[PDB]
Design a binder for this molecule. Sequence first.
Ligand SMILES: *[C@@H](C)[C@H]1/C(=C/c2[nH]c(/C=C3N=C(/C=C4\NC(=O)C(CC)=C4C)C(C)=C\3CCC(=O)O)c(CCC(=O)O)c2C)NC(=O)C1C
Ligand SMILES: *[C@@H](C)[C@H]1/C(=C/c2[nH]c(/C=C3N=C(/C=C4\NC(=O)C(CC)=C4C)C(C)=C\3CCC(=O)O)c(CCC(=O)O)c2C)NC(=O)C1C
Lengths: 160, 160, 160, 160, 160, 160, 161, 161, 161, 161, 161, 161
Amino acid sequence: SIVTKSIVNADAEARYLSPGELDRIKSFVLSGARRVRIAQTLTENRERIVKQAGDQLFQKRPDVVSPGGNAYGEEMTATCLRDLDYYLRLVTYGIVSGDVTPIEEIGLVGVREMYKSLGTPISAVAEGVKCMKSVASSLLSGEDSAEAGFYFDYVVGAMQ
Amino acid sequence: SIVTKSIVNADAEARYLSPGELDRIKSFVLSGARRVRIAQTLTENRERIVKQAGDQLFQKRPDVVSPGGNAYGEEMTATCLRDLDYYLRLVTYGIVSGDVTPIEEIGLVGVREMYKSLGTPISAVAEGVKCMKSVASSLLSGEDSAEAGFYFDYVVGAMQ
Amino acid sequence: SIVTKSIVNADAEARYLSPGELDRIKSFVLSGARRVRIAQTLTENRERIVKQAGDQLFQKRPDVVSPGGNAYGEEMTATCLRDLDYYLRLVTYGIVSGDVTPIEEIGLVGVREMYKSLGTPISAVAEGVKCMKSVASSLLSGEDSAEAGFYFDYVVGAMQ
Amino acid sequence: SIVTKSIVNADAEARYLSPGELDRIKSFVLSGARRVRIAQTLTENRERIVKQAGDQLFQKRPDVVSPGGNAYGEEMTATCLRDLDYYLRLVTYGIVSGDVTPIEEIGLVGVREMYKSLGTPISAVAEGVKCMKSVASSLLSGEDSAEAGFYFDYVVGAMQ
Amino acid sequence: SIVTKSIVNADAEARYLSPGELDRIKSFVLSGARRVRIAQTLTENRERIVKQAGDQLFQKRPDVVSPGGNAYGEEMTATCLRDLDYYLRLVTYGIVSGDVTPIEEIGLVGVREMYKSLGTPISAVAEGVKCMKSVASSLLSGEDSAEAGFYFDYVVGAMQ
Amino acid sequence: SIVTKSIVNADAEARYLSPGELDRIKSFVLSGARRVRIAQTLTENRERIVKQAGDQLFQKRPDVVSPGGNAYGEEMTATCLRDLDYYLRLVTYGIVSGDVTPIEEIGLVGVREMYKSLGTPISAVAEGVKCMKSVASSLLSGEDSAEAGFYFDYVVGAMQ
Amino acid sequence: MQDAITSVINSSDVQGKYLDSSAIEKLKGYFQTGELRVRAATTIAANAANIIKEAVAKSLLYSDITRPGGNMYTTRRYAACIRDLDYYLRYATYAMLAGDPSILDERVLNGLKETYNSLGVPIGATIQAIQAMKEVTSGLVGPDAGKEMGLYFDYICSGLS
Amino acid sequence: MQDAITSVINSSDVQGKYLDSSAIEKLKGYFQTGELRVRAATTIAANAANIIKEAVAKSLLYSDITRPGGNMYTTRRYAACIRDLDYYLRYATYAMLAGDPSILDERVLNGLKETYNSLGVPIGATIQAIQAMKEVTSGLVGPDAGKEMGLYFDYICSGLS
Amino acid sequence: MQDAITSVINSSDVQGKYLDSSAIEKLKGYFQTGELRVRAATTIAANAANIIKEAVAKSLLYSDITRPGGNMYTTRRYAACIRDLDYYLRYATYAMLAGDPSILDERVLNGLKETYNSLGVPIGATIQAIQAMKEVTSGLVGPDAGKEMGLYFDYICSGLS
Amino acid sequence: MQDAITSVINSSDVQGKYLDSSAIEKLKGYFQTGELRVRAATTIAANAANIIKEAVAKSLLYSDITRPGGNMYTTRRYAACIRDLDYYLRYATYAMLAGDPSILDERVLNGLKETYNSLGVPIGATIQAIQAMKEVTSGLVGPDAGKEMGLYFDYICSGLS
Amino acid sequence: MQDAITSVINSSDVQGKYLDSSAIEKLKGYFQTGELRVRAATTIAANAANIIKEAVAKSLLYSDITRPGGNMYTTRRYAACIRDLDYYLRYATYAMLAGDPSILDERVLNGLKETYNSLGVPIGATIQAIQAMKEVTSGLVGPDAGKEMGLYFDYICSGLS
Amino acid sequence: MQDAITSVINSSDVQGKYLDSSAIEKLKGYFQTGELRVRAATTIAANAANIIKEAVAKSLLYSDITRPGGNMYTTRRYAACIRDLDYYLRYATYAMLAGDPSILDERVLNGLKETYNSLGVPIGATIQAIQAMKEVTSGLVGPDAGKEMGLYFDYICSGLS
Ligand SMILES: *[C@@H](C)[C@H]1/C(=C/c2[nH]c(/C=C3N=C(/C=C4\NC(=O)C(CC)=C4C)C(C)=C\3CCC(=O)O)c(CCC(=O)O)c2C)NC(=O)C1C
Ligand SMILES: *[C@@H](C)[C@H]1/C(=C/c2[nH]c(/C=C3N=C(/C=C4\NC(=O)C(CC)=C4C)C(C)=C\3CCC(=O)O)c(CCC(=O)O)c2C)NC(=O)C1C
């Protein structure tokens, strides 16, 4: 969270928090309800954001659906949409934290080593997350949608 | 400002800004009017915040007013209240910036070397700024007053 | 070459060459003719090693041949086989040098940044070079073939 | 040995061995018999290479044989030829290893501190080893002799 | 002492002492009696050097004697003259040592942190030690007085 | 000199000189006449200290006088006694300086590289300087002799 | 090194669970006490040099510990001791701003009792000095912010005893 | 290294002047365009890898520069060139988020023309590549954010020519 | 850190003995298996990324260890685990090219069981993963090179158990 | 970096000459003024903070240089300026204790006029401040020590002009 | 790390006591033996390379320790052993010049017996070599300087046994 | 920093050309002179300390340069000069083993004439010393290896003049 981040930076410089740092934690705890509602909307439309984005994936990157293809059918294509639910969950976490750090630790540090091991193309996972983004920016209005989207675009961009 | 600070930190890590950093510049430009009003109130009540705080200084630290005393009369006591106007001005600067950096650069880096040269006691300058604080927290309500005060207390605390 | 490499390492330790280093340059200049013949065979069968390996690529990774596909037809598929001729040429260079350094400098440092820019999958370029390998190990006997192959396998392995 | 040396250098760069490094171990294990024969010749003519070189030492550096002299007679001159047998033995070790490292560790690191302690002149030990060299290059033909000699000249040169 | 200091510097450079260093310990042990007499004079006139200097302090810095004042009467003014006896004692120590190191360790490292905690002005402690200096340079002739004074002036100067 | 040495050390710590450092320059300028007399005695007995020590060298290390020998006769033996006059001169320099630094710079840094180039044994130059020492400690009484000797023994000891 | 918000997120993640109502509850509970924490936090920074002067006065001064042969005698040791007091106060404010005591188990109490028994530092006079620092702070941040702050001063004492 | 806000503060300070109405005017003018800047800023981060692929395609590819003996031949030089393109785009976004071109005079154009004439890098093909990067960005951030962004791409070109 | 050749040389040297027929025997025996070692060595480098993908598939995947709360869950821990597998395979190839297991006692197994019981890494699932890596390699280097290679995979297992 | 004693020694050494009567003369002349130098040296260390306060008061204060837009405005620049004054005084005392101006050509004036014209520092107001520092010192060390000291303050001025 | 002079000063300071007659007594007693210490100190520096050659000859040479498989066999180990002898002699001279054995408890014997039992160094042959170094020194510095010197050689032996 | 083999490879690569008969010609020509180079290379390493002693004797010794006030007077400067001679000989052997003079333009002659005119080193007496080093080497490696070696000694001289 940005509380952790402001404590860690002040501790490093062996001080108490600055004015600009106490204002940043205030702006954050008073945005906390906006956050908890964006997250709630995304957790509720879980099944939808994943299935509709996976359906959309197989129509922009069709190469990964069977001839050769890492998602090779009934146990595999299921696992590809699993991984999409793993990043949807890390994105709600990030939004209530005001911080990309729980997405980084759990799913972005070492993401290239792991997917080159399994033989999965990572441009295709980035494209998947870009498709869940759209399906979420539909279910979300004006400023809630600009905010959830900051966190989907970071995840996508750490994947290529 | 916190814009400068967020650019400098991203550049150092050779990246684009984070979600939590773009939210921090948004929270700041939308607080910008609250800032510009707190500053305006303090610039307008300039003569008052300085004279009334100086009058109050000479009643908590009386030792500095004549027997020995660095503020020694008509040219000196005038210069002591001058220095109080120099820190009032650096405090309004800080509030509209959301940042202690223009107070640090202009008046806090090297403040001990300079006052031990002139023979001025710095506990007494810290006490002066603590007195201008009070005279400002009177002229300011509820949350404007908690905010101007974050910046007066930083200046005081870098002085002892 | 391994001459350059032995001079650079002795210079770094500010000395003349060791026994084991003068023996290594001797073993190398007396293998020089074996090298120049392996290279000659590969330069002569240039058109064959490239076209037959490209034909083989499109049969193990078919995904890259048209639906979506980076090699998208008459100007593109031509460019994919071009890139195969660029790495065949860097491999003959390496064999006469006894050194992977001219392959590294010209085509392996920055190969991931460049292919993620163009959108080319690098597993597919590694697979291409693995296919030119086979078509070369056919045209080459017993020990010439074990040697050319050390250099094809290094290039492939720096690509994933 | 050069096997140890190639493993240590690849491990340091956290990799598998290069083409040029696997060729260097191959050139070495196939020279292994040439090595084991040069060593065998030197181990067999042990008594000869030492006594004849010591006899020759006392005729180029005569100063060390009695007036003052570190080799001062029946227990001392015996010990001077002992030390010559110690470096003959470290030289055969080096030749079968393709490496100066067993000569360095056992007899060249700290050789100046030790001889300045005992009062022995080291130019005189270097000259001794230069004399065993000659007596060996006689007993050895064309290329065996160029090779044993790389290792005698390194030992001599680390001694002044 | 300068014995400790000369051993520490030679040990650091892993050597025996220089000519210039053995001459410096000789000059020092033969001055040892001059030292032990200057110290003795100051230890004997202890009560005098402290009370007369404190009486003099309150006449150059009068601000510290009651209105506000850190030395605030019967328990406080007593403690201010205590601290003067603490630095007189560290000064005799220094003179017999030929070294400022026992004054530094016991009373100068951290002297600013400690006095800003208690609220004591340090210019006023420096001024106190400058007053004990005078009362000592009266009781001491020609060269004994130039020497005790090197050590009073160091203490004063590390205090502002 | 020890003036240079005390300035360099204070400058490094960006300060004025310590008590113990101003006492060390005083002890030195008041010993200055003792120094200038020891030097004068050695400069006057120049021809004697060199010829008598060289005559003595050839009787403790006789090996260096002709059979093989670096001092090989009329131009060579002359040059060996020259080098003895070079170190006598650097020793008088050192004594008036209270410092081994003019002996180090002019004749001890690089003394091993230079003598192993010319083929001169350095134990033999150390022994020469040990012989000029004796011839000087005869011409010098009680404490002048203990002092000149600190400087002859340093030179000898930096030579083996 | 976690505050209340990441504490909930990790507990979710080892179960592979999205944030449920129970987790949203704990979360809204921090965000509610949030403005409380920033204000008390400022009040301590502002009164730092001062809480410490008063706490030292009340417990440590004019005692055996400040007289020759005591662990606070010499200027070096007096200054190294109020440095420690600064560390205790700064870190207890951190853990309150965080809502969680793990910065204190991590970067403060991690083998401190061992260091103190080694250098020969009196732990009892330190717990004495922290309990006073506990009284002066609570009588400056007010009651709501003080029940909370006290927890972290108390967490320090129990890790030293 | 100043943004629009500290630019005004310093200009005040060399005169020893408090912030006057004129300074408040310039200040409110940044704070007004502020949300505009954060949004365009995100849109570039999001489309970074992509603006560059399209700009390279349009200007640099299948030319003499990519064929043997050209400054973009070898993988090392192709990767070092889109690295430079990344630097230009990231820093132009910075200067727009800042409202001021001094980060670009400071950390980007500071003696670059000299470095480019030394290593033998073609400045004309780089200005070509930046002008294309200028077109692709403006046709993605929209018109309000694009008049502004273009200024900073243009500031780069004039410092290279 | 010795291979077969220096092992013989040192054993000679603590006895002050020249290389005798017995030592020449052991020496010629390495030089004979030498070309065997360079070839198997290449075959592993060439198939490294691949031996590991297959070994993981066979032992570690779709299990409790990859699901939340397992030591291979999170990308950081999945990548740190196949990194370890890379270390085991690279070092077993080293020790075979060397003829001797001392690089493995030295730079791999030196207090690893202690590190694994500390971080909480399952040793049994690692020995499981190494035994599979043992099967895939032997079925790629062939029988002569495989009796030998297996010794070094086995040496790792016995130092973990 | 030489004092009077090594100056004589080197001049001897480039001629391969032992110390002659002329050299002994110059040498005894330093050793004679030696106690003079240690005393004046102490008197400056003792009055350092003070010479500088008085010199600043006399030349630099209440002027354009201390008011906004002047090179001594801001605390950072006031403190960096009396730091320079400290450097001038400490080094002039060094060169007097040494008997020779080479520490000043070496570690002080080595391209300072260039640095001062770069940062925009007024050299005339600095020579003004040094000449005052020259007056306050001479009126504290006394006449014998003052003819000498002045030489080194003057050596600084001529290297700045 | 204290010599006789600071030993007395600290013992005074933990009591807050000025230097009394008893302390002045101990002090004058060092200053009296002082010229004795500087002279013996020079005589060892002058004869250092030599005390060691003779001590080695008498105890260590032509034995099992110098023959293959002995801890002084190889040049590296012969040179590392007379290095240790140099350390013992240089530090015993230091402690005598100091009047106090604390430099030896501090920078020499601090866990050496542990290091020696680890590397496999024979302590008995080292105490043998130090006792010989004890005999050669005393028969070169003379009797007054030798009762004293011996104490420090003996202090080393008792810390190794 | 290229030898004859990479010189040919790069010249091929800026043209995007495979190795043609002309390139194979130049290549076989190095591989043919190759054993020649390793042997001459050994002969210099073996006689290094010696070529230099003889070259110094012939040109530099008993002259003005070794007497007081000369650039080779003092031990520091005598040792720094035969160090330079070592650098010239070691690097000329490198460039011959390489077949190409670019290591000498790169790591030896790169602005040396400037360094020599700065420190005040006589270039004419150095070219004198290198020409002698040229004569002693050729009269030790024999004629085939000597035409070649001389080229590199000559390349040094022309870069100093
Ligand atoms: C089949 C092998 C793969 C494939 C390749 C492919 N490459 C390209 C475009 C380019 N490739 C290069 C490569 C290099 N330039 C170098 O400097 C080196 C080192 C010697 C190499 C290997 C370059 C520069 C280009 C760009 C073209 C140019 O001259 O500027 C493409 C075309 C991309 C496009 O759409 O424009 C393709 C198809 N395609 C695959 O999918 C595979 C498996
Ligand atoms: C003629 C070669 C020179 C010579 C030699 C000489 N050596 C010795 C004494 C010793 N030499 C050694 C050497 C080594 N020990 C090792 O560990 C190694 C590495 C394998 C070597 C080379 C040692 C240990 C000794 C000491 C004897 C012992 O077993 O302890 C002497 C005798 C010195 C004495 O006076 O006691 C001599 C004569 N003499 C010369 O002048 C020359 C040219």
